[PDB]
């Protein structure tokens, strides 16, 4: 019965706020609290702050106190978290969680915790704007034989914001492929790799082709990779 | 505050065996509000112990939690391929704090890298910056060590490396290794090589290869 929708990823330049929702369904409201986590990309759960559903009392963390506002609409049982004055290392997946720590009504401890969760909505500070990735081949050669196995990718470089898809062989080559997470370089922009390993005796014969996709850009970019001479 | 420190950061241990993991805190934490979740890759935190030891609904009896004061243990009695997770334990006795959190990791026998290099494409060459790529394929354990060389001289401060999460067939790392130059800069030397250090080597393993070869 219990269910939390949030609402959709956010894209937000330096200094703005980002309002994020958590419609609540299947359960009395007014009865639990509602608690908001986030998690940075790579980094753990961080705690920001409680709610209470019935009279509006709020409890923030000391780090986000002065840019977090937590504010609930029992009419819509509809949870919302503002965060105003983002900075980059604000860029985090934002959780909201039925809270059962803290009682909604007198504020004592409970017994429990939180029990279930949101989907999750990533938020994403920069000051880049969209940029469609530029795909570079990483052609194959002697060097990039270990035994009877070649090794070749692509390189995805230059782009904002995440994610891209990469695909070989329109998705028939899926056995042997690795799409290494994206880097973030220092000029803002995103930028990683995809490889596969192949018998070095289909070098000459087969043809290999990564499919780069970039949505926020509309880039479909279709490099062919060939073993350089 | 109270400071959660959960160790070690990374668990390795093969599936079936038993797993303990500890959440030790700065101060004396009540029983009845310490909590512990499980976090699966790319999937929100899941409740998992509460109070300590009382499971919540719907989580398998091979978790159990224990521990009173300030040192609290998270027992999985058998690892399940799923188990394999990020588990975090929450304490709301002042304020509320989550942990560090414990990586399970999957404990496979020592995989030496395939070490591949490539150069960087004559098309990106025509937009003046060279990107060098060396490729770490399938190895085991994560920790690895990749140094750039040009022309002898080792780089620093001017690569950046992506490492895949453990590959869910052979339990095996990918590691990435981008050494990015301008066209200028690039052009100035002949020799490119990274020297791949890693416990399955009993030597560093060195790909190279010479610009305009
Ligand atoms: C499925 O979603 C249900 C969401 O709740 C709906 C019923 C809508 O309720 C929302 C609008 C709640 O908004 C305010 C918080 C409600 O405040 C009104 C004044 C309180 O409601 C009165 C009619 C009765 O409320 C009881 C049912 C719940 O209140 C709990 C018990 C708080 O108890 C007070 C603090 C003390 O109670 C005295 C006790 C000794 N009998």
């Known amino acids: 019965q219990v269910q939390l929708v949030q609402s959709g990823a956010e894209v937000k330049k330096p200094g703005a706020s980002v309002k994020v929702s958590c419609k609540a369904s299947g359960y009395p409201f007014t009865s639990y609290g509602i608690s908001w986590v986030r998690q940075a990309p790579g980094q753990g759960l961080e705690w920001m702050g409680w709610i209470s559903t019935y009279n509006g009392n709020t409890n923030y963390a000391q780090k986000f106190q002065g840019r977090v506002t937590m504010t609930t609409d029992t009419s819509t049982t509809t949870g919302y978290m503002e965060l105003r004055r983002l900075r980059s290392d604000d860029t985090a997946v934002y959780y909201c969680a039925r809270d059962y720590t803290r009682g909604a009504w007198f504020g004592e401890s409970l017994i429990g915790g939180f029990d279930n969760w949101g989907q999750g909505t990533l938020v994403t500070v920069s000051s880049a704007s969209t940029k469609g990735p530029s795909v570079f081949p990483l052609a194959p050669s002697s060097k990039s034989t270990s035994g009877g196995t070649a090794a070749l990718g692509c390189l995805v470089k230059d782009y904002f914001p995440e994610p891209v898809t990469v695909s070989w062989n329109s998705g028939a080559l899926t056995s042997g492929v690795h799409t290494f997470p994206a880097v973030l370089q220092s000029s803002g922009l995103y930028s990683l790799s995809s490889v596969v390993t192949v018998p070095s005796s289909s070098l000459g014969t087969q043809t290999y082709i990564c499919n780069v996709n970039h949505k926020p850009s509309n880039t479909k970019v279709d490099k062919k990779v060939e073993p350089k001479s | 505050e109270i400071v959660l420190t959960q160790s070690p950061g990374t668990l390795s241990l093969s599936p079936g065996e038993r797993a303990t993991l500890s959440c030790r805190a700065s101060?004396?934490?009540?029983?009845?509000?310490l909590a512990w979740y499980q976090q699966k890759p790319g999937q929100a935190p899941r409740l998992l112990i509460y109070?300590?030891?009382s499971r919540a609904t719907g989580i398998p009896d091979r978790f159990s939690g224990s521990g009173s004061g300030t040192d609290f243990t998270l027992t999985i009695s058998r690892l399940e391929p799923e188990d394999f997770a990020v588990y975090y334990c929450?304490?709301?006795?002042?304020?509320?704090?989550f942990g560090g959190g414990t990586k399970v990791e999957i404990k496979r026998t020592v995989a030496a890298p395939s070490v591949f290099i490539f150069p960087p494409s004559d098309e990106q060459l025509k937009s003046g910056t060279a990107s060098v790529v060396c490729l770490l394929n399938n190895f085991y354990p994560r920790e690895a060590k990749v140094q750039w060389k040009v022309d002898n001289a080792l780089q620093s401060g001017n690569s950046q490396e992506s490492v895949t999460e453990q590959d869910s067939k052979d339990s095996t790392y990918s590691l990435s290794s981008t050494l990015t130059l301008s066209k200028a800069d690039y052009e100035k030397h002949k020799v490119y090589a990274c020297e791949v250090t890693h416990q399955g080597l009993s030597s560093p393993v060195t790909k190279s290869f010479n610009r305009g070869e």
């Open positions: 109070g300590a030891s």
């Open positions: 101060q004396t934490v009540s029983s009845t509000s």
């Open positions: 929450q304490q709301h006795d002042t304020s509320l704090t």
